[PDB]
Amino acid sequence: PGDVAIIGASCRFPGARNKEQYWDNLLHGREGVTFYAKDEIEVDETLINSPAYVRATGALDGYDEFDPAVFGVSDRMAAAMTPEHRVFLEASWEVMEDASYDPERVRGEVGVYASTNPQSAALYSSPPDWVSAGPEVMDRSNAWLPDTITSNVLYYLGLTGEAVTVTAVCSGFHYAVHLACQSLLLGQTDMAIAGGVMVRLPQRRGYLWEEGRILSRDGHCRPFDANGTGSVLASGVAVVLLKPLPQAVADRDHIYATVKGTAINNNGISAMAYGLAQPERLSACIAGAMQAGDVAPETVSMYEANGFGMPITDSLEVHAAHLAFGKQSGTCSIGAVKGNIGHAGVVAGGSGAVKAAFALYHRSLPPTINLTELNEEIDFPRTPFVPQLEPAAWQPECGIRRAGITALGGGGYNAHLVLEEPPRPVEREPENRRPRIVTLSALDDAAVSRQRAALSSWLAEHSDARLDDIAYSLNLGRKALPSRWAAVISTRDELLEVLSGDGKSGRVSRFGQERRADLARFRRTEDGLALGSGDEMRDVQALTELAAAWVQGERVNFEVLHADERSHRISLPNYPFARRRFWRTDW
Amino acid sequence: PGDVAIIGASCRFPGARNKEQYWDNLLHGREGVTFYAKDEIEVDETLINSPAYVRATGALDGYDEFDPAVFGVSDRMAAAMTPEHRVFLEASWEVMEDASYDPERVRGEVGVYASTNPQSAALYSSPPDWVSAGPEVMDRSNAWLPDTITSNVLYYLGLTGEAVTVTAVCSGFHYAVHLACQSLLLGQTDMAIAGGVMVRLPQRRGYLWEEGRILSRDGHCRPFDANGTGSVLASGVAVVLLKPLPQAVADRDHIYATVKGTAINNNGISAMAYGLAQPERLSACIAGAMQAGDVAPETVSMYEANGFGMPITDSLEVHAAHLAFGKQSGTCSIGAVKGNIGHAGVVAGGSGAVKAAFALYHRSLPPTINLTELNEEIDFPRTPFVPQLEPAAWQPECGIRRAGITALGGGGYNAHLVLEEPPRPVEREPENRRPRIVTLSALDDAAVSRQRAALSSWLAEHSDARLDDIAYSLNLGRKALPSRWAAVISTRDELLEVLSGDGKSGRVSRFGQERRADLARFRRTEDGLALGSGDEMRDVQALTELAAAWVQGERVNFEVLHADERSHRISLPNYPFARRRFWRTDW
Ligand SMILES: [K+]
Ligand SMILES: [K+]
């Protein structure tokens, strides 16, 4: 094998609070940069009136919001945690939900590899003082140190494995995915959480334009444009769940795309100015990634570029990509997502990787925006690359869909990873009509009601989703939380009816109001309560009593319920986090 | 009836390390602003390449230099003290020396009134933490708090009295002089140290030009000029020693000028933009100061203005002064010293007051520089004021020389003080030719040699200085320090010869090496050793043994040595401070 599957994803970007909102924005060519009036910016009093100050930024909505009760975190600790700690932790929870894996029931080793910006931690609060070694000191250290961005995931999700934090400037996301795959291919872990986080402080802030530098003169990012003047600074987060491809296919996971190869290197002594791609070192990086995945440049029909929007930086990157593709490669779609959202720093490579992964999944090519006058110096007809001006269906003459994503940063950091479309979906056996248990749990009743509203809305969106996959994913892919709700249904239409309204019109809901469940009916197993016979697991009354016992707070062995069928994990709505704002008051 | 004499002065400004250098620069119309290359500024990385950044400032040479051993300060404490603490402490030492008063032997109550910029301390180091009450905590507080800028002077100079620190933005010097004079007129103190200190941090730094604001566009300050765009930021220190006029004449002090009146008020609800003078409030301040000293505007022939260099602010200030002078005032010379050095913040009013005092003392009017096109909007021929374009002798038709100095600041702070030339000198009796004792002491032997070189150089410049004044000032105006030197001479030429070379060619020096002084020859007084008879005080051998006893470290009553003659205190060189560099290393 040596291929790594992306079985779950979670991200937040300017103008997008989730991946579905992110993909919909890329499809319609929307811009997520925010423009402010002078009074809306409450910092930079010395610069706000300068003619060179641009009141534009890529804002991250809810950078200060967190739901500590879901993770078991105290309010004091939530304020002590840097925004990058909270945002990445909340995204790791969501990436596990998107893959339908309950961390409490994960039997293998999970690695957490993430990249973070230490400049953000240094601006949020003063660092820990290690003059004493009390427990409150350890709490303050775990809230501030970049080293514990990955450790806190292992602790607060209940996972066991290894945690590694890397700091790689603007290539952070790729370096995390690169290192995560080494862990998987060497067999040290079974699946891996990999990603990056960037929260710029102060958040609501502009920047200062200087002639010839990477920052834009008008606040617009125009990649590959002749009139491009640079990019905008942005914040975001992107996390993916990684798993070896043969194991992901065997376990009937939900696969967005596969990672064929990754490669990293540094410009070293052959250094450039910031944003300038050195042709020899970057091309060696791109070629090494394709060599690692055994993909030929003829087969890559999408190239997601770094693309600041500077004529000189775009020319050096397209030339470096040209050296790696060769002459005989053919034609390839080129684009830069920074035109949509700006430069997201640590996670800038993640926005491009997430764009490429979803492009392979939906077999669609999103456009590159703010492109009106093509850069004549890049001479695109003499290169394999064609700027994606319009959205288009992805139907390559090659026969296979493969994409390459590049991340450039300061300090000479280079990185490139090559993705392939997921395996073709297998032929499914016809769905058996039988009563099934569906479950929803959160911390309080209001959050469960939001889960019911989100699921009924989701059912309208995805009319081709099978009912046996929904129940398998909800029952085996979500953590059992205190406030619980369940129903016993046989069709998709019955599911929509029980979810509607207050949710109490269902068979299980009326059972819980009348009497408590009789536990002598069930057999206790190592994983919880189970039904006494195989014939019992197809009786509506037996399934109804078991679900009510679960709603009452008992632990149920959901594995033995789905042992007879080979269902698939699917992507369902995430937890509806109640987002209170947390910010430190003492420096 | 309430006149206060300026009997000592000390200052440092851009381009001047002492008051003699400052007056000489004003006389020749020199500019003390410094211009830097981009690489010479090691701060403001984000602004250094902006087209609006002006690499100009009024630097204070040696802002980080200090000689803590002379004050009894430890090296640890010298690094803990803010630069404003050290600069003001060193200037207070110099101002007592300039007036020829030894703080150990001052019999009265001395008040120390100063103004400081608390923003500098907040940038130099983190503030003290009061979680405990140990002596090391108190040392850190005394090193950081602005309240102890004045207290440390009382403690380290050996004075007893009262200390008051005020913070009055750009009117700081005037408010200190105002409060000092109230202390004297109410009899709370016998003499007062008054001044201010301004050390801008970071020191070597430019500024950002913004159109229509107070900062200059080219780095030059052009007061009353039609093409003026503002001023430059400057650092400095200015301290004066104040004493009631009748007492200063009775003690034969050296009087630069006298303070006739002072007045303060605030713009209040009648507020303006920064630097803009409200005519009604500022004129009331100017008129109130002249009313306090019982001086009529017809008698004021010099007006030292605030003078930023902006056409609108210069026009409003000249209008306010016109309202206070009336129509029948006559003619008056107007100038603004900010053209020479820039805006010195807390001590900005000090630069003008010191310029006016030396103008009154030397009977000269220094020019206003950078003035090529007069502001037609002010209409100077229709006002009593005439811009002093060239240096000129001060011979007013009024008959008396009086000056008014105005200080404007942010927050609406206004201040104005009126000075008069010193009293006419009395007729001196011819100098008796007799042997006299002259003394020099410092902290180490190398500093004493610098004192001898400084004293011999001074003798060439001031050939009209009487020897009985020189000995009286050296013997009664300097602190007795461990490394000592003395000589017994009768003429100025004998003084020049013994000071020359290694300084060991005198009878006192040859006496100390051969034999020790026999103290039984002398009589003990409450203030030290004295000679047994009046006839002995004219014997060379008796005076030589007494001087040698002092060099060996004994305490000598110098009051009784000069009791028979009425000598005068004169201005002699200051201590040659060995200036080691001190800066904090931990925030
Ligand atoms: K008043
Ligand atoms: K005796």
- Same-domain check for residues B367 and B500: no
Method: X-ray
User: CA-based angle B46:B48:B49, to the nearest 5?
Assistant: 95
Closest ligand, as measured to the CA of B292: 1
| A132: contact with B, CB 8 A cutoff | no
| B52: contact with A, CB 8 A cutoff | yes
Element (H, E) at A172: helix A172-185
Alpha carbon of B50: minimum distance to chain A alpha carbons (Å): 7
Whole-angstrom distance, CA of residue B42 vs CA of residue A15: 38
Which candidate, B424, B318, B290, B289, places its Cα nearest to that of B363?
B424
B265 alpha carbon – ligand 1 mean position (Å): 5
Q: Are A259 and A177 in contact (CB under 8 A)?
A: yes
Q: What is the DSSP string of A509-528?
A: HHHHHH----GGGSEEETTE
Side chain identity, residue B491: T
Cα separations in angstroms, A242 against A190, B81, B123: 9, 57, 48
CB contact under 8 A, A210 and B52: no
Q: Within 13 A of B90's CA, how many CA atoms are on the CB side?
A: 28
| A51: contact with B, CB 8 A cutoff | yes
- Residue span of the structural domain in which B384 resides: 1-468+563-587
Whole-angstrom distance, CA of residue A583 vs CA of residue B405: 50
Instruction: Count the neighbouring beta carbons within 10 Å of the beta carbon of residue B201.
Output: 18
Side chain identity, residue B244: P
CB contact under 8 A, A52 and B52: yes
B306 alpha carbon – ligand 1 mean position (Å): 19
- Same-domain check for residues B148 and B200: yes
CB contact under 8 A, B52 and A50: yes
Residue B18: DSSP 8-state: S
Q: Tokens in use for A358?
A: 């979803």
Q: Tokens in use for B12?
A: 């440092």
- Same-domain check for residues A147 and A261: yes
Side chain identity, residue A103: P
- Same-domain check for residues B211 and B180: yes
B240 alpha carbon – ligand 1 mean position (Å): 23
Residue of chain A with shortest Cα separation from B48 = A210
Q: Are A306 and A407 in contact (CB under 8 A)?
A: yes
User: CA-based angle B23:B29:B30, to the nearest 5?
Assistant: 85
- Same-domain check for residues B434 and B491: no
- Same-domain check for residues A226 and A299: yes
Beta-carbon contacts of residue A495 (< 8 Å; ≥ 6 apart): A438, A459, A467, A470, A487, A489
| B210: contact with A, CB 8 A cutoff | yes
- B210 contacts in chain A (CB < 8 Å): 49-50
**Strand ranges in B305-384 using DSSP code E only, listed in sequence order:** 332-335, 364-365
- B208 contacts in chain A (CB < 8 Å): 46-47, 50
CB contact under 8 A, B208 and A51: no
B406 alpha carbon – ligand 1 mean position (Å): 14
Q: Are A507 and A542 in contact (CB under 8 A)?
A: no
Q: Which residue has the tokens 């003082």?
A: A129
The torsion defined by the Cα of A563, A567, A573 and A577, in degrees rounded to 10, comes to 20
Which candidate, B538, B535, B527, places its Cα nearest to that of B560?
B527
Residues of B (70-99) whose Cβ lies below 8 Å from A: none
Residues of A (18-47) whose Cβ lies below 8 Å from B: 46-47
CB contact under 8 A, A210 and B47: no
Residue of chain B with shortest Cα separation from A49 = B210
Side chain identity, residue A396: P
Q: Which residue has the tokens 């200059």?
A: B216
B346 alpha carbon – ligand 1 mean position (Å): 20
Q: Are B33 and B219 in contact (CB under 8 A)?
A: yes
| A49: contact with B, CB 8 A cutoff | yes
- Same-domain check for residues B356 and B478: no
Partner residue opposite A49 with nearest CB, options B47, B49, B210: B210
Whole-angstrom distance, CA of residue A179 vs CA of residue A183: 6
φ/ψ bin of B570: left (φ > 0), alpha (ψ from -120 to 50), beta (otherwise): beta
B286 alpha carbon – ligand 1 mean position (Å): 10
B439 alpha carbon – ligand 2 mean position (Å): 23
Beta-carbon contacts of residue A201 (< 8 Å; ≥ 6 apart): A83, A120, A123, A124
B179 alpha carbon – ligand 1 mean position (Å): 12
- Same-domain check for residues A358 and A478: no
φ/ψ bin of A514: left (φ > 0), alpha (ψ from -120 to 50), beta (otherwise): alpha
Residue of chain A with shortest Cα separation from B46 = A208
CB contact under 8 A, A50 and B51: no
- B119 contacts in chain A (CB < 8 Å): none
B553 alpha carbon – ligand 2 mean position (Å): 18
| A50: contact with B, CB 8 A cutoff | yes
User: Mutating which of B210, B217, B274, B586 best tests the A interface, going by the most A Cβ atoms within 10 A?
Assistant: B210
Alpha carbon of B172: minimum distance to chain A alpha carbons (Å): 24
Instruction: Count the neighbouring beta carbons within 10 Å of the beta carbon of residue A189.
Output: 21
Residue of chain B with shortest Cα separation from A52 = B50
Whole-angstrom distance, CA of residue A237 vs CA of residue A198: 6
Q: Are B92 and B157 in contact (CB under 8 A)?
A: yes
Indicate the number of domains in chain A: 2
CB-defined contacts A:B, below 8 A? 16
B50 alpha carbon – ligand 1 mean position (Å): 44
- B46 contacts in chain A (CB < 8 Å): 208
- Same-domain check for residues B491 and B569: no
Whole-angstrom distance, CA of residue B246 vs CA of residue B242: 12
| Residue ranges with CB less than 5 Å from ion ligand 1 | B 265
CB contact under 8 A, A51 and B52: yes
Instruction: Count the neighbouring beta carbons within 10 Å of the beta carbon of residue B366.
Output: 24
CB contact under 8 A, B208 and A47: yes
| B49: contact with A, CB 8 A cutoff | yes
- Same-domain check for residues A61 and A184: yes
- Same-domain check for residues B479 and B351: no
- Same-domain check for residues B427 and B338: yes
Element (H, E) at B118: helix B118-124
CB contact under 8 A, A52 and B51: yes
DSSP 3-state of B244: strand
DSSP 3-state of A287: helix
Cα separations in angstroms, B228 against B31, B235, B395: 16, 21, 31
CB contact under 8 A, A210 and B50: yes
| A52: contact with B, CB 8 A cutoff | yes
Beta-carbon contacts of residue B434 (< 8 Å; ≥ 6 apart): B490, B538
The greatest distance separating any two alpha carbons of chain A, rounded to the nearest whole angstrom, comes to: 79
